């Protein structure tokens, strides 16, 4: 006799979940949660309420265009690792607590409910939730065990980016604005239009379980090179047909301009702009990231770890990239922590203008076989400057130039303060 369950609505509990998962600014309209951590649902029913003796409910989550259990982009779990459990029941409502694994692929999931009383099961789409990286969760790869550092590197929307020269250091304020309306949606689009998604979407969604993979993707997709990336670089001081790199005050205008014109290159940017937009996207996705500036930054073109002049390679007044916090199970043990990611195009990696992630520790120790792109990053911070001087006798003499030392006063914003931290020690040993 007992007739089927009839759902009125699923309450996603935005305000509670938002506060618990540190996504309150993301959760005013849709549910955004962090992986590896329980979140609440409340099912409202129309006829009778859930009855454990009678009913058996099963859940389904799916992400991406080709979801499968093998890939970790589809899970099925019964109402009783993806779990769902009954926490409370009152009149017409049933209160649940779902959990996700700490190694779940980030992104937009669709949540369905199967309800049976022993016969033909009825199906319901409950809604959608976006699942992010979780720096608060000890099992997650991005885990950062310092609360003050999680505040700075994930949650803070304003920061400072260092520019100028080694001698004359200056800075600008920058609005990263990772939690402003529409920015998270633009980040998901960035991943969805990336080359590997276009090539094999099911595998690409599967691998968003790694901050390494995601990190690498972003260091590629922030520049427009090779793809539908965000920024076009320009360095010749003529920007009349775009925006001056120096006009920008924040990542938000760039990301939105990119979306509005159908994922079209944004004119124009330079290093700090690339790094800044990358910091926005990575912070939005929950990967603790920071912008670092390197003074006397060298561009090695022939991988000999020397910067060569002929009286020819380049040393910049400053160059900016980002570091992101994550374990590295793809490497030898001991490389967890900060990974250099570089979205500014300079040298190609695997046929494409991207760079990193590479452990900062690998740079410092000179373990240049470590992926990704350690030889290049080492040269940026710790190269010898060489002049091939032509002599009066027609001979060419190699000489070490110590007038301009590569990799000085490497800088990022202090935790929780409006001040500069020197992190030169993390990249290179003193001599």
């Amino acid at each position: 006799m007992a007739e089927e369950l009839v759902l009125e609505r699923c309450d996603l509990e935005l305000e509670t979940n938002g506060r618990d998962h540190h996504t309150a600014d993301l959760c005013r309209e849709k549910l955004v949660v962090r992986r590896g951590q329980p979140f609440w649902l409340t099912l409202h029913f129309e006829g009778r309420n859930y009855e454990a003796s009678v009913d058996s409910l099963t859940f389904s989550v799916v992400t991406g265009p080709a979801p499968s259990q093998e890939a970790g982009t589809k899970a099925r779990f019964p109402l009783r690792d993806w779990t769902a459990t009954v926490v409370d029941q009152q009149d017409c409502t049933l209160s649940l607590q779902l959990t996700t694994p700490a190694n779940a692929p980030i992104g937009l999931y669709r949540l369905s409910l199967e309800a049976s009383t022993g016969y033909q099961g009825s199906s319901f789409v409950l809604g959608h939730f976006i699942l992010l990286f979780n720096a608060w969760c000890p099992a997650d790869a991005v885990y950062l065990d310092s609360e003050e550092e999680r505040q700075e590197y994930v949650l803070t929307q304003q920061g400072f980016i260092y520019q100028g020269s080694a001698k004359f250091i200056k800075n600008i304020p920058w609005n990263f604005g990772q939690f402003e309306d529409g920015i998270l949606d633009i980040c998901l689009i960035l991943l969805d239009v990336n080359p590997k998604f276009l090539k094999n979407a099911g595998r690409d969604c599967s691998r968003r379980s790694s901050p390494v993979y995601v990190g690498r993707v972003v260091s590629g997709m922030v520049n427009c090179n090779d793809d539908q990336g965000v920024l076009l670089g320009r360095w010749d001081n003529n920007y009349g047909d775009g925006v001056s790199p120096m006009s920008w005050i924040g990542s938000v205008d760039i990301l939105r301009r990119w979306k509005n014109h159908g994922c079209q290159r944004v004119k124009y940017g330079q290093c700090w702009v690339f790094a800044a937009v990358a910091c926005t996207v990575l912070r939005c996705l929950g990967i603790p990231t920071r912008v670092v500036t390197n003074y006397n930054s060298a561009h090695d073109q022939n991988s000999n770890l020397l910067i060569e002049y002929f009286r020819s390679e380049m040393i910049w007044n400053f160059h900016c990239w980002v570091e992101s916090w994550m374990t590295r199970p793809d490497l030898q043990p001991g490389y967890e922590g900060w990974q250099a990611l570089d979205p500014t195009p300079q040298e190609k990696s695997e046929g494409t203008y991207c760079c990193g992630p590479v452990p900062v520790r690998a740079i410092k120790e000179g373990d240049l076989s470590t992926k990704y792109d350690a030889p290049f990053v080492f040269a940026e911070v710790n190269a010898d400057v060489v002049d091939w001087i032509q002599q009066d006798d027609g001979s060419v003499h190699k000489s070490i130039n110590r007038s301009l030392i590569v990799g000085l006063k490497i800088s990022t914003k202090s935790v929780g303060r409006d001040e500069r931290e020197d992190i030169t020690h993390t990249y290179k040993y003193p001599e």
Binding site: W235, C271, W272, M314, W316
Partner: peptide, 5 residues
């Protein structure tokens, strides 16, 4: 701006 030395 960023400038090559």
């Amino acid at each position: 701006p960023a400038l090559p030395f």
